Design a protein around this ligand. Structure first.
Ligand SMILES: O=c1c(Br)c(OCc2ccccc2)ccn1Cc1ccccc1
Ligand SMILES: Fc1ccc(-c2c[nH]nc2-c2ccnc(F)c2)cc1
Ligand SMILES: Fc1ccc(-c2c[nH]nc2-c2ccnc(F)c2)cc1
Length: 341
């Protein structure tokens, strides 16, 4: 049966939510919606409530809305953001024009933490372990995140971490070189690249590759990791890309031990493995969890994999009303997870 809703305006946005959620307080905005912190009276915990902006504005928005709901309904892992609740104030499909999502409030991200801070090795171990543990799960569902950066890593006062969906500086800074090149057959290790860039920054206090644009970004990456060797060169189909790359002044892969000088040598070894230029040679999330850098955290029996995830809708070309109806179906069928201390 339907709960009682109440309406309010927060920052020129209307929020209509069940009375169970109290003390809404805006925390930010992330392209596809706005977020408020709230108090969940049913559990006594603080939650983040996201209101999707214009969910059915176009086929793109409608499919994006469906995609996010499907993804968040599927993610059930300690280090990945999932759903406590999904609701709409709409009492019918024709009424349906707003989607709210709720998750447990972590309360900060790594954008907030990195800033004015170099971290000790022990905290970097724990943070990056958690990221990799979440990534192992995501990758096992044959999902690629594609946009991992500090703002997409939500962290609580205990330094427990969950991977966000979408977060609240430059995104290109964390992006794999093959994506800057525009390769359409990139793999899951694009996310491993991002984690390498994030880990590097946590250890040093500086952006590993602060490119001003995609070209600058590629150039900074190749200065650290070297211009492509022959094995990699042969895998590049594009004539313009290969002409460009091979016309650059050719560069050796740097010794990372020299670059990340003060760092724990196990940290440098993992970084070398994460940031190999040829993506076919980069370490996987599962492999990284078994690396000696994480010896004090790694438990192979507590690093679970995801249930099968149906991404077939991704190929489909549907009407806005069809995406809308499917999303509505997904809201109605939502089963919350159980309360457990
Ligand atoms: O801890 C979170 C969570 Br938790 C978020 O969740 C967004 C969300 C909400 C509902 C569904 C899916 C995602 C977003 C940012 N942050 C970090 C953050 C929270 C409050 C202030 C600053 C940073
Ligand atoms: F067991 C309970 C019962 C009510 C609360 C509560 C505290 N403040 N506001 C509420 C509230 C208001 C409207 N609907 C609902 C909850 C908290 C725990
Ligand atoms: F300057 C470069 C050259 C190659 C890469 C690269 C890294 N991993 N995979 C690739 C790749 C494979 C096949 N085709 C591509 F276009 C790219 C990245 C930057």
């Amino acid at each position: 049966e339907r709960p009682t809703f109440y309406r309010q305006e927060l920052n020129k946005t209307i929020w209509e939510v069940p009375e169970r959620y109290q003390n809404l307080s805006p925390v930010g905005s992330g392209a596809y919606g706005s977020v408020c912190a709230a108090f969940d009276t049913k559990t006594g915990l603080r939650v983040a409530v996201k209101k999707l902006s214009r969910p059915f504005q176009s086929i793109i928005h409608a499919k994006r809305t469906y995609r996010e709901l499907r993804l968040l309904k599927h993610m059930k892992h300690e280090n990945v953001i999932g759903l406590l609740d999904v609701f709409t104030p709409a009492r019918s499909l024709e009424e349906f024009n707003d989607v709210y999502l709720v998750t447990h409030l972590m309360g900060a991200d790594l954008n907030n933490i990195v800033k004015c801070q170099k971290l000790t090795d022990d905290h970097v171990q724990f943070l990056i372990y958690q990221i990799l543990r979440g990534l192992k799960y995501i990758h096992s569902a044959d999902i690629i995140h594609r946009d991992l950066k500090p703002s997409n890593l939500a962290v609580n006062e205990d330094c427990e971490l969950k991977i966000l969906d979408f977060g609240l500086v430059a995104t290109r800074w964390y992006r794999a070189p093959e994506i800057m090149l525009n390769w359409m057959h990139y793999n899951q290790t694009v996310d491993i690249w991002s984690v390498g860039c994030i880990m590097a920054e946590l250890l040093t206090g500086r952006t590993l590759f602060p490119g001003t644009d995609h070209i600058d970004q590629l150039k900074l990456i190749l200065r650290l990791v070297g211009t492509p060797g022959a094995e990699l060169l042969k895998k590049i189909s594009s004539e313009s890309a290969r002409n460009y790359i091979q016309s650059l002044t050719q560069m050796p892969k740097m010794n990372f031990a020299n670059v990340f000088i003060g760092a724990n040598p196990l940290a440098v070894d993992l970084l070398e493995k994460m940031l190999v230029l040829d993506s076919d040679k980069r370490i996987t999330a599962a492999q990284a969890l078994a690396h000696a850098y994480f010896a004090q955290y790694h438990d192979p029996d507590d690093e679970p994999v995801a249930d099968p995830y149906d991404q077939s809708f991704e190929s489909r070309d549907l009407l806005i009303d069809e995406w809308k109806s499917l999303t509505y179906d997904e809201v109605i069928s939502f089963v919350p997870p159980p309360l457990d201390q």
